[PDB]
């Protein structure tokens, strides 16, 4: 039974990018805590392999992998026509290659999604599209003088979905490739909801953290690769290397536990009358830190989880020219406004930053530690 | 005879897309009368260039779906893409068509220019900057007087748009993405390009007068809207009291800019350029007053009892309207690469433009009046 009070309709769900970080955890909750059927579309199924026929016949009947690449595949429209609800996670979303592969980024996050939107509207399906907190980009407050008191007024940093602005860098700041593409797909989805009647929901994750996020380089991902900060610092800790802090890690972020976030998504799935229409910030405003702090906190927790104590200097600064490359820029302080998601679905993140890091770093140590010891010799 | 870098001007075949538009039409007049270049005029409609079909070649083509485009591109040395829905009126009313127009439909053009090693001049907009960071500081806060917060420099000022529900930014966001893509294509592969950001170009064949040149219920850009208001002696509708600001440049001044870009690829390839006239700033109220004054001069007849009136943007534009508040173009970059500056005054350009408007539309609107 749902939030409205009505009983829960069971449904076939087409999940695109379902073998990803978010996808994989989403399948865990749908399978274990709901009646719904999942159609898992992705190019790779590595992260959901524990849930499939090869590994177990415990769920089969309610999940079905389909190796598909949505750039060119006729089978997609049928697969959509198969389900009642489409969830589109499929997207290049590591900042590393917003400024290095800008074309592939734009094509991934805007162009390749268009068909998905076409089919949902044509065949009268419901769509949940995953955008990003990067759509807000920078805070208004960031342009006031250093230590100007207006910075303290939440007016200038809290990111409300119905009224805060989308602020990006100039064009030459190619990192915004990603954000601009996400912005346009949102305007299009919203437009399609307006010009025709598309039932939709848009999700703006603020830095979701957990097991299975991205990859450790030189183990289950390219040696030359560069993931998102969780994975980057995870790698740094496992190899007993200091944590590289980009331009002194003074930007701020708010991390939410992956499990907390998935609860949110589920509520959206099961309450379409309160989610259709809306755009939703999913983040945990209470777990704010600078990147320096994330680093310190992670080394502390790691030392707890690992046994071993910390390094002489456990971090070090590095320029974004050195780290990210040429056209890097950065959001400075993401603080998600909760009013809309809180009013519509009653959601709140239960989990602490420290708690979530303990959890996540234990998974990381359990998984990667022997492997990284064997790849040092 | 000669470019800025001193070299001679080799003649060129120019593929002009959206060539029968406002800007296109004036661009053709200039290329024809003042340069050796050959023009291929692609548009669906040729009304505004029909006077020039007595070195130019119309091709009734719709770039959404048309195979002959790639050959037409492969024909020329330089492509200029003006083709774009660009009246604010239907950013919030036809958002899908806007996005498809300003982003999706342009992609092929970009494909062909990069594949076949042609040079591209893409027309974006000052709307890409959107709102001024100054606009978010408190009413009458002094930091608003610091140019730091309103001058729009192309290499560093930010793109600030409204939230998603403010559907007017459909247009701006699409233009933003096409710019990032063009620039990306210039980076990931070697595309020779230039991007143009017009700040409110004003002149003769801009848009249409409703009930004469176009639909009666239609809604163009402010020049045409007020032109109609004056011609019919109605008051000028001021949207939420017309307190937003703009900077108008004379169409003739602007075309000179474009020409320099055409003939100096050495200085224009790579760059993005503000083309506007920072000296001709006014609020919309002021544009209205100034236009009624000039009109009275040009027409003979004097003004009316109340020559303007306020109207809400709910009433005027519809549901998801929002607005840029203060466009002031920077110009360091254009001024230092092409040496361009707008000669022409606002008053002067309005005198000129309103005389053209009166000459053209006044007997036609007297006929249709009765
Ligand atoms: N994790 C976060 O903190 C975070 C933050 C902001 C936004 N997001 C957004 O959430 C969504 C999911 O991100 P994630 O964390 O699961 O990343 P992820 O990369 O783990 O998930 C994306 C999955 O989509 C798949 N995919 C990409 N292109 C594809 C194609 N053509 N065909 C089939 N599959 C394809 C990938 O193979 C991958 O498994 C993205 O849209 C992202 O923009 C995530
Ligand atoms: N007029 C201004 O002051 C101003 C301000 C900012 C930006 N711009 C930009 O400059 C460019 C031109 O502006 P304009 O005032 O000439 O607009 P316009 O509408 O007068 O000209 C655009 C032309 O492109 C044509 N076109 C549209 N779709 C087409 C298609 N599928 N195939 C062929 N032709 C098509 C139109 O029919 C029209 O003739 C646009 O890209 C606009 O965004 C202009
Ligand atoms: O090894 C790293 C990885 C990331 N960052 C920074 O930490 C923040 C989080 O970046 P991430 O790549 O996780 O994505 P973002 O939040 O920028 O979308 C950003 O300010 C990055 O510049 C860092 O200093 N070192
Ligand atoms: O009849 C009109 C037409 C336009 N405007 C306003 O004048 C400005 C210019 O709008 P336009 O459509 O010319 O182009 P924009 O600068 O909005 O791209 C905007 O503030 C409009 O809201 C107005 O008050 N009355």
Curated annotation (Swiss-Prot), chain B:
* Activity regulation information from UniProt: Inhibited by UDP-D-galacturonate.
A Gene Ontology biological process annotation?
nucleotide-sugar biosynthetic process
User: Transmembrane stretches, by residue range?
Assistant: none
Entry-linked InterPro entries: Arna-like_SDR_e, Epimerase_deHydtase, Lipid_A_modif_metabolic_enz, NAD(P)-bd_dom_sf
One Pfam annotation reads Epimerase
What is the reported tissue distribution? Widely expressed with stronger expression in leaves and stems, and lower levels in flowers, siliques, pistils, pollen and roots.
- Catalyzed chemical reaction(s): UDP-alpha-D-glucuronate + H(+) = UDP-alpha-D-xylose + CO2; UDP-alpha-D-glucuronate + H(+) = UDP-alpha-D-apiose + CO2
Q: Which GO terms describe its cellular component?
A: cytoplasm; cytosol; peroxisome
Q: Which cofactor does it need?
A: NAD(+)
Subcellular localization(s) per the UniProt record: Cytoplasm
Tell me which residues bind UDP-alpha-D-glucuronate: 91, 125, 127, 168, 171, 200, 237, 239, 246, 317, 321, 323, 327
EC number(s)?
4.1.1.35
* Role of this protein: Together with AXS2, catalyzes the conversion of UDP-D-glucuronate into a mixture of UDP-D-apiose (UDP-Api) as the main product and UDP-D-xylose to a lesser extent, via a cycle of oxidation and reduction. D-Apiose (3-C-hydroxymethyl-d-erythrose) is the only plant cell wall monosaccharide with a branched carbon skeleton and is found in rhamnogalacturonan II (RG-II), apiogalacturonan, and several apioglycosides.
Oligomeric and partner information = Homodimer and heterodimer with AXS2.
Write out the similarity annotation: Belongs to the NAD(P)-dependent epimerase/dehydratase family.
Protein name, as recorded: UDP-D-apiose/UDP-D-xylose synthase 1
Name its species: Arabidopsis thaliana (Mouse-ear cress)
């Amino acid at each position: 039974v749902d939030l409205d009070g009505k009983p829960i309709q069971p449904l076939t769900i087409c999940m695109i990018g379902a073998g990803g970080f978010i996808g994989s955890h989403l399948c865990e909750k749908l399978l274990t805590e709901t009646p719904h059927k999942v159609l898992a579309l992705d190019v790779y199924n590595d992260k959901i392999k524990h849930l499939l026929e090869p590994d177990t016949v415990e769920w089969s009947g309610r999940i079905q992998f389909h190796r598909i690449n949505i750039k060119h595949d006729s089978r997609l429209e049928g697969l959509v026509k198969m389900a009642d609800l489409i969830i589109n996670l499929a997207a290049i979303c590591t900042p590393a290659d917003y400024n290095t592969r800008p074309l592939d980024t734009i094509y991934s996050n805007f162009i390749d999604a268009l068909p998905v939107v076409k089919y949902c509207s044509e065949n009268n399906k419901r769509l949940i599209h995953f955008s990003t907190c990067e759509v807000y980009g920078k805070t208004i407050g960031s342009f006031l003088p250093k230590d100007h008191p207006l910075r303290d007024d939440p007016a200038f940093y809290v990111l409300k979905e119905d009224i805060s602005p989308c602020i990006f860098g100039s064009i030459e700041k190619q990192r915004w490739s990603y954000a601009c593409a996400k912005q346009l797909i949102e305007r299009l989805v919203y437009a399609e909801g307006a010009e025709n009647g598309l039932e939709f929901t848009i999700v703006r994750p603020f830095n979701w953290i957990g097991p299975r996020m991205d990859f450790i380089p030189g183990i289950d991902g390219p040696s030359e690769g560069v993931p998102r900060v969780l994975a980057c610092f995870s790698n740094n800790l496992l190899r007993r290397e200091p944590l590289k802090l980009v331009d002194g890690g003074e930007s701020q972020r708010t991390f939410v536990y992956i499990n907390d976030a998935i609860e949110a998504v589920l509520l959206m799935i099961e309450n379409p009358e309160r989610a259709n229409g809306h755009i939703f910030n999913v983040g945990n405003p209470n777990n704010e830190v600078t990147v320096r702090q994330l680093a310190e906190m992670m080394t502390e927790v790691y030392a707890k989880v690992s046994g071993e104590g910390a390094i002489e200097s456990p971090t070090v600064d590095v320029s974004s020219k050195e780290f990210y490359g040429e056209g890097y820029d950065d959001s400075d302080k993401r603080i998600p406004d909760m009013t809309i998601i809180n009013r519509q679905l009653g959601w709140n993140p239960k989990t602490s930053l420290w708690d979530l890091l303990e959890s996540t770093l234990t998974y990381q140590h359990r998984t990667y530690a022997e492997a990284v010891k064997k790849a040092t010799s």
